Design a protein around this ligand. Structure first.
Ligand SMILES: CC(C)CCSCCNC(=O)CCNC(=O)[C@H](O)C(C)(C)COP(=O)(O)OP(=O)(O)OC[C@H]1O[C@@H](n2cnc3c(N)ncnc32)[C@H](O)[C@@H]1OP(=O)(O)O
Ligand SMILES: C[S@@+](CC[C@H](N)C(=O)[O-])C[C@H]1O[C@@H](n2cnc3c(N)ncnc32)[C@H](O)[C@@H]1O
Length: 211
């Protein structure tokens, strides 16, 4: 059936159509719906300084329609946490490691909310990272994400004090990538694999080491 596709520098030539579609959906969702006005752009594409040659996109596709997704960025480069929100990680420190990737821009289009897709997206980050040998992901998120992580069996390590960010309670944390977490999620989604990787093989950890 429908799969989550891992899109990076090595295979984006197969997904240029899909990538553009997702930038516009990100604008509809994060700018128009969430009202994150600092991300508004006149081209109607929601693109920031962490959308570059090293970004990995995990996009839920139905045919060529993007129905959900999220992205990963190496913490060996300047990151959203290190550059924008370092005060949120003042207790433990901002991650900087080839084996830790920054996780952001999680979305499900309205048509697919409150269904099977969400848990598939939760499984997808675990599956991709385990395959790549990535040990942890880091995230800045609103505190309503905590019960969602816990419900999916995600092992969460807070990096600092929660704080108001543009009027919303926000925190920085890592998530442990675990075979055990993934195994349970595979059972729950009723699929042995949720991540499709077309085109040339990506060596994410090697790329992050170069950075
Ligand atoms: C890498 C990550 C960490 C970066 C995040 S990046 C920021 C998170 N992303 C977004 O807010 C994008 C806009 N939203 C979406 O794409 C979807 O609403 C998401 C968050 C993916 C959730 O989709 P689904 O789980 O399929 O279903 P849903 O009915 O939309 O939500 C399920 C439950 O989740 C909760 N929820 C969703 N959005 C919320 C919000 N803005 N504030 C407080 N609570 C919120 C809520 O409890 C809801 O159930 P309800 O109470 O019955 O409505
Ligand atoms: C929870 S935080 C940031 C992380 C967000 N959950 C994500 O994964 O994309 C949301 C707040 O950070 C801001 N923000 C998101 N990406 C940003 C960037 N690249 N630069 C500056 N601010 C950003 C948004 O305007 C919003 O007020």
């Amino acid at each position: 059936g429908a799969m989550i596709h891992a899109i990076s520098a090595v295979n984006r030539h197969l997904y240029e159509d899909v990538l553009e579609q997702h930038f516009r959906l990100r604008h509809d969702i994060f700018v128009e719906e969430r009202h994150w006005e600092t991300l508004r752009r006149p081209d109607g594409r929601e693109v920031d300084s962490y959308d570059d040659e090293d970004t990995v996109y995990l996009l839920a596709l139905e045919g060529r329609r993007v129905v959900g997704g999220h992205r990963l960025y190496p913490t060996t480069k300047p990151s959203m946490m290190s550059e924008v929100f370092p005060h949120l990680a003042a207790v433990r420190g901002c991650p900087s490691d080839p084996l830790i990737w920054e996780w952001s821009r999680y979305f499900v289009v309205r048509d697919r909310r409150d269904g099977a897709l969400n848990l598939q997206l939760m499984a997808a980050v675990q599956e991709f990272c385990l395959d790549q040998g990535i040990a942890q992901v880091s995230a800045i998120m609103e505190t309503w994400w905590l019960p969602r992580f816990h419900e999916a069996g995600f092992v969460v390590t807070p990096l600092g004090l929660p704080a108001l960010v543009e009027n919303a309670w926000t925190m920085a944390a890592t998530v442990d990538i675990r075979r055990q977490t993934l195994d349970v999620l595979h059972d729950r989604i009723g699929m042995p694999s949720i991540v499709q990787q077309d085109g040339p093989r990506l060596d994410a950890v090697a790329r992050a080491n170069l950075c």
